[PDB]
Amino acid sequence: SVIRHFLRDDDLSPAEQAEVLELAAELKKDPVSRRPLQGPRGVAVIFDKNSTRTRFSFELGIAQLGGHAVVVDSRDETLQDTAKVLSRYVDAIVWRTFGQERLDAMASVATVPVINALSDEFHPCQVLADLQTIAERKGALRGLRLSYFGDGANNMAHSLLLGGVTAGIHVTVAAPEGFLPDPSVRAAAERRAQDTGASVTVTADAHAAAAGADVLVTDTWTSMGQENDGLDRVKPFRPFQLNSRLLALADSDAIVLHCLPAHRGDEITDAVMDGPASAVWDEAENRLHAQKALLVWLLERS
Amino acid sequence: VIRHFLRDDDLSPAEQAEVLELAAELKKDPVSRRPLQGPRGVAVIFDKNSTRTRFSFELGIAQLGGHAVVVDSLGRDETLQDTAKVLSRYVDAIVWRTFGQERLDAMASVATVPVINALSDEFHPCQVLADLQTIAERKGALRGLRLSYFGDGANNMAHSLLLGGVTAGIHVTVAAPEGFLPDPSVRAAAERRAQDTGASVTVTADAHAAAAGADVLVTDTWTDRVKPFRPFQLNSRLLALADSDAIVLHCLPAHRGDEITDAVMDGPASAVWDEAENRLHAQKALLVWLLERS
Amino acid sequence: VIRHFLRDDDLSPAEQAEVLELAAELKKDPVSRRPLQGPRGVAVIFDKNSTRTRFSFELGIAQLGGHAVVVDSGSTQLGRDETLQDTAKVLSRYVDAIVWRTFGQERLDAMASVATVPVINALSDEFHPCQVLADLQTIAERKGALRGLRLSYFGDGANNMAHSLLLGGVTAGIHVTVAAPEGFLPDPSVRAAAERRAQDTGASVTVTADAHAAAAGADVLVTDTWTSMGQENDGLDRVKPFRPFQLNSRLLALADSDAIVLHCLPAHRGDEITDAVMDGPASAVWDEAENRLHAQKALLVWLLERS
Numbered sequence: 001s002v003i004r005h006f007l008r009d010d011d012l013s014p015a016e017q018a019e020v021l022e023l024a025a026e027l028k029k030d031p032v033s034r035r036p037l038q039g040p041r042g043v044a045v046i047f048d049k050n051s052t053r054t055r056f057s058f059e060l061g062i063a064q065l066g067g068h069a070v071v072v073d074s075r076d077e078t079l080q081d082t083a084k085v086l087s088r089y090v091d092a093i094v095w096r097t098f099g100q101e102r103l104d105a106m107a108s109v110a111t112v113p114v115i116n117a118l119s120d121e122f123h124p125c126q127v128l129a130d131l132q133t134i135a136e137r138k139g140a141l142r143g144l145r146l147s148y149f150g151d152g153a154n155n156m157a158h159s160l161l162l163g164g165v166t167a168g169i170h171v172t173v174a175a176p177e178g179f180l181p182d183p184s185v186r187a188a189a190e191r192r193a194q195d196t197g198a199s200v201t202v203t204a205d206a207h208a209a210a211a212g213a214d215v216l217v218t219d220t221w222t223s224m225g226q227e228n229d230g231l232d233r234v235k236p237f238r239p240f241q242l243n244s245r246l247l248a249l250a251d252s253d254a255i256v257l258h259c260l261p262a263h264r265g266d267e268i269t270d271a272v273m274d275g276p277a278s279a280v281w282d283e284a285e286n287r288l289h290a291q292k293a294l295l296v297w298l299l300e301r302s
Numbered sequence: 303v304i305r306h307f308l309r310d311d312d313l314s315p316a317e318q319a320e321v322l323e324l325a326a327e328l329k330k331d332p333v334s335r336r337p338l339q340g341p342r343g344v345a346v347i348f349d350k351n352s353t354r355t356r357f358s359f360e361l362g363i364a365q366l367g368g369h370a371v372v373v374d375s376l377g378r379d380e381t382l383q384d385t386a387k388v389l390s391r392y393v394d395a396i397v398w399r400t401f402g403q404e405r406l407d408a409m410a411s412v413a414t415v416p417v418i419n420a421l422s423d424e425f426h427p428c429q430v431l432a433d434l435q436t437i438a439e440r441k442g443a444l445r446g447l448r449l450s451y452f453g454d455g456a457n458n459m460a461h462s463l464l465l466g467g468v469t470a471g472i473h474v475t476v477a478a479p480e481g482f483l484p485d486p487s488v489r490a491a492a493e494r495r496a497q498d499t500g501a502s503v504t505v506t507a508d509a510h511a512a513a514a515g516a517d518v519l520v521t522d523t524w525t526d527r528v529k530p531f532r533p534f535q536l537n538s539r540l541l542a543l544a545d546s547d548a549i550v551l552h553c554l555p556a557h558r559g560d561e562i563t564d565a566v567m568d569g570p571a572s573a574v575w576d577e578a579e580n581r582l583h584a585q586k587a588l589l590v591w592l593l594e595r596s
Numbered sequence: 597v598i599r600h601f602l603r604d605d606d607l608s609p610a611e612q613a614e615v616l617e618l619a620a621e622l623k624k625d626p627v628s629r630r631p632l633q634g635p636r637g638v639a640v641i642f643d644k645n646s647t648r649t650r651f652s653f654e655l656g657i658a659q660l661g662g663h664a665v666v667v668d669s670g671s672t673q674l675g676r677d678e679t680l681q682d683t684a685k686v687l688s689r690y691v692d693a694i695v696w697r698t699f700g701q702e703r704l705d706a707m708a709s710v711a712t713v714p715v716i717n718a719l720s721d722e723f724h725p726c727q728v729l730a731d732l733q734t735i736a737e738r739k740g741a742l743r744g745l746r747l748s749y750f751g752d753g754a755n756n757m758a759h760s761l762l763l764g765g766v767t768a769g770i771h772v773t774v775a776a777p778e779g780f781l782p783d784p785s786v787r788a789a790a791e792r793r794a795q796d797t798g799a800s801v802t803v804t805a806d807a808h809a810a811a812a813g814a815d816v817l818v819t820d821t822w823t824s825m826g827q828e829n830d831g832l833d834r835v836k837p838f839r840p841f842q843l844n845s846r847l848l849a850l851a852d853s854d855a856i857v858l859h860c861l862p863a864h865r866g867d868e869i870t871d872a873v874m875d876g877p878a879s880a881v882w883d884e885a886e887n888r889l890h891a892q893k894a895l896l897v898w899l900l901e902r903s
C-alpha cells in the first residue's frame with residue numbers, strides 16, 4: 001500500500017475529506033470505538049516549537065485510540081536518519097515544524113504516515129475541526145459561504161482556502177494589501193474549487209466579505225515569529241476586526257469561528273466571542289475528534 | 303452540582319470521612335475504581351513545578367483508568383475563563399498548583415468539572431488527607447486525638463492541619479514563634495468548624511507544652527535566617543514528652559538536622575514513609591469522590 | 597533478593613543468555629508480557645536528559661502494561677534537597693523499578709544498596725549496559741551464536757560504550773578488542789573485571805593502538821562519538837588522536853567479509869563513521885536502534901520476575 005500523509009488540506013480529495021469528517025462525527029459519539037493503536041503502539045509527537053494545545057489534543061486522542069503518544073519537544077541528525085529510526089518505533093509521526101519543505105522531506109522517506117500538526121504555511125488539522133463544527137451547526141457544507149478576516153497569508157487563511165473549497169464551500173479572504181494569500185496556495189485552491197463547484201475570493205473590503213456570509217472566521221493578527229518583523233501589525237487589521245457590526249452584515253444564522261487562543265479586543269470582540277453565533281468552544285473540542293479521525297483514516301489506508 | 307476541593311473545610315466532617323474510607327479501600331485494591339476508564343483526561347497544571355505532586359497525581363490518575371495531561375510552567379495567552387471553558391470539554395477534572403487562592407476560586411466558579419488545589423500558598427489540603435489516612439491506619443479513630451504542628455505556623459501545612467484536623471475531630475495545636483502565626487481568617491474558620499466536631503484550636507509559642515501529651519507531632523520545612531524556628535525543632539527531647547505510641551509526620555522533602563533530626567525521622571515514631579505513599583491513595587480517593595458527586 | 601543492573605557483568609553468562617532470549621521473544625510478541633499491568637509505575641529519572649533513552653524506556657514500559665513516570669533534569673538533582681537513601685525509600689513505595697541516568701557509579705551503588713525494587717542503569721559515565729544488550733541482540737540476529745565471535749571497538753577506549761562492550765562482550769563469550777590512542781584507554785578496574793569474566797567464557801580481552809590490526813579478521817566493528825557533551829570543555833583536541841580510528845570503507849574492508857557495523861545513536865557522520873559505512877550493507881545501526889526497545893523490555897521483565 002501507498003503510505004498516506006497529511007501535510008496540507010488538499011492532500012485529501014473531496015471524497016476522502018468527506019470520509020474523514022464522517023469518521024470525526026462517529027468518533028465524537030463513540031470515542032473509544034476505534035482502537036487501531038491498541039497495544040499500546042506508539043505515535044511520535046514532535047515539536048520544533050512547543051504548542052501546549054496541540055500536544056494536549058493529540059496526546060489524549062492517541063491514548064483514546066489505544067496508543068501511547070511519545071512527545072519530543074523543542075542538528076545532531078539528518079531528517080532521513082530520524083525518519084528511518086522513528087519508522088521502527090511508532091505507527092505514525094505527528095510533527096509541528098516551520099517550513100513546508102521539512103515536512104515534505106520527512107514524508108518522502110518515512111514508511112509510516114506523517115501529519116502536519118501545525119506549520120508556518122498550513123494548519124490542516126484545525127480546519128478539519130472547523131469543517132466538523134460547521135457541519136454540526138449547519139448541515140451540508142457544499143455551497144456555504146465562508147469569510148476569513150485578518151492576516152490573509154497565515155496558516156489558517158491558507159488552510160481555510162484549501163480545506164474549505166475541498167468541502168465545496170465558497171471561501172473569501174478579507175485582508176489588507178501586503179497581507180494576501182501565497183500565490184501558489186491561492187492557485188491550488190482555485191483549481192480544487194473547480195472540482196467541487198466552490199470559488200475563491202480575495203478582497204480588502206471587509207464589509208463586502210461579511211455580507212451574506214454563513215460562517216465568519218478570524219485568527220490572531222501576529223504569530224510569535226512575527227513580533228520582531230518590523231511592521232505595525234495593529235493599524236492595518238483594525239478595519240477587519242470581527243465585531244458586532246461586522247457580524248450583523250452576515251446571514252441572520254451565521255456562526256463565528258476562531259482558532260484558540262483569541263486576543264479579545266483585537267481580531268475579535270467579547271460580544272462576538274460570547275454571543276449566540278460563536279461556535280469557538282465546540283470548534284476547540286472538535287480538534288480532538290477530527291485529529292483522531294484523521295489518524296484512524298491514515299493508518300487504515302497505509 | 304459541581305464539587306471542588308480548594309481548602310480542607312470544603313469537605314464537611316461526614317464527607318471527609320467518606321474520602322478517608324475510600325482512600326483505605328483504594329490502598330487495598332488500587333485498580334478497583336475506574337471512573338476515568340477510556341482513557342478520560344485529567345488536566346494537571348503547574349504554575350510552579352512540583353515534581354512530587356506531579357508524580358503522585360500522574361500515577362494515581364493512570365490507576366483510575368485515566369490519562370493525566372500535565373502542563374508545566376495559565377493566564378499567559380488567554381483569559382482564565384476561556385481556559386476553564388475549553389478544559390471542561392477535554393478533561394473530567396482539573397488539578398492545579400497555583401499560588402494565590404483568588405486564582406483557584408476564579409477557575410472553580412467557571413469550570414463545569416471539579417477543580418482540585420494540588421498545592422497553594424495558603425493551603426495544602428491533599429497532603430493533609432494523606433496525613434489523616436496515615437494517622438488512622440496507625441491509631442484507629444481520629445476523633446479526640448491531640449495533634450501538634452511545630453515551626454512555621456503561617457505556611458500552608460499549618461493552615462490545612464488546622465482546618466483538616468478539626469474537621470476530623472482532632473484537637474490541633476500550632477506551636478510557632480511570634481512572626482509566623484496562622485492567618486487570622488483560617489484560625490477563625492477552624493475554631494468555627496471545631497465547635498461542630500468537639501475539637502479545639504490552640505496557638506502557642508511554647509513547644510514543650512505543645513509536645514506534652516501529643517499523639518501526633520508534625521513539622522515542615524522552615525523555608526542564620528531561621529533563628530526563630532530552632533526552639534521548635536522536632537528532636538528527641540520534644541518527642542520524649544508525647545503520649546506513648548505517638549507518631550511523627552513530615553511531608554517530604556525534609557532537611558535533616560534543621561526542623562527534624564535523624565533520630566526522630568528514622569526512629570519508631572516516624573510515619574513519614576507511609577505518609578508519603580498515602581498521598582497516592584488519598585488523592586485518588588479525592589478524585590473518585592469528586593467525580594461521582596459531579 | 598532484589599536484583600539490579602548497574603553494569604554488564606551484574607548478569608552471569610547464563611543470566612545474560614536468558615535476557616537476550618527474552619528480548620527475541622518480545623520482539624516477536626511485544627505485548628505478551630504484562631508484569632506491570634495495572635498500571636504499575638516505573639520511575640525513569642534523568643540527572644541529564646537523554647531523549648532517545650526516555651523515548652525507548654517510556655514506550656517499552658507502556659507495552660509491559662505499566663506507566664513510566666519521567667523525571668527530567670529540570671527537577672532538583674537527586675542528592676540536593678534530599679539524600680539518595682531517602683529518595684530510594686519513597687520511590688520503593690510508588691514504583692516497581694527505578695531506571696536512572698546519572699553520572700558517577702557510586703550514586704547508582706548507593707541507590708541500589710537501599711532500594712527494595714530493581715535499579716537499572718539507563719546510561720552512566722562509566723557504563724552503557726542496556727545499549728550493549730541491544731548490540732548483542734542485534735549481533736545474534738545477524739550472526740547466530742555469539743560465542744567465539746571477534747568484536748573490535750574503535751575510538752575513545754575509556755567511554756561508557758568501550759567499558760560495556762568489554763564487560764558485556766566477554767560475558768557473551770566474544771573476543772573483544774578495544775582500539776584507542778594512548779591516553780584514552782579503558783579504566784584498569786573494568787579491564788581487569790573483563791579479563792576475569794573472560795576466563796569463565798573462553799573470551800579474551802585485547803587493547804591496542806593499532807586500528808588495522810584490530811579490524812583484521814573482526815566479525816563486528818563498533819564505534820561511538822569521540823566526545824560527549826561533558827567532555828567538550830576538557831581542554832583536549834578530541835579530533836586529531838581519533839582520526840586513525842575512523843570506521844571508514846578501508847577499515848571495514850580489512851575485516852571479515854561478512855562483518856557487521858554497530859554505532860549507537862546519535863552518530864556524527866564524517867567523524868567517527870563515514871556515510872558509506874553507515875548506509876552500506878554491513879551496517880546494523882538501524883536494527884540496533886530498534887532493538888533498544890526490546891532489550892530494555894526484556895531486562896525489566898527479567899529483573900521484575902527475579903526479585
Ligand SMILES: Cc1ccc(B(O)O)cc1[N+](=O)[O-]
Nearest residue numbers: 082085648651652861885888
Ligand atoms: C528511541 C529512539 C528514537 C529516535 C532515535 B533517532 O536517532 O532519531 C533513536 C532512538 N534510539 O536509538 O533509542
Ligand SMILES: Cc1ccc(B(O)O)cc1[N+](=O)[O-]
Nearest residue numbers: 053056057260284287385388
Ligand atoms: C486541547 C486544548 C486545551 C486548552 C485550550 B485553551 O484555549 O485553553 C485549547 C485546546 N485546543 O483547542 O486544542
Ligand SMILES: Cc1ccc(B(O)O)cc1[N+](=O)[O-]
Nearest residue numbers: 044046072077082647648651
Ligand atoms: C532524537 C531526535 C532528534 C531530532 C528529531 B527531529 O525531528 O529533528 C527527532 C528526534 N526524535 O523524534 O526522537
Ligand SMILES: Cc1ccc(B(O)O)cc1[N+](=O)[O-]
Nearest residue numbers: 354357358554578581683686
Ligand atoms: C511521589 C513522590 C516521589 C518521590 C518523593 B521523594 O521525597 O523523593 C516523594 C513523593 N511524595 O512525597 O509524594
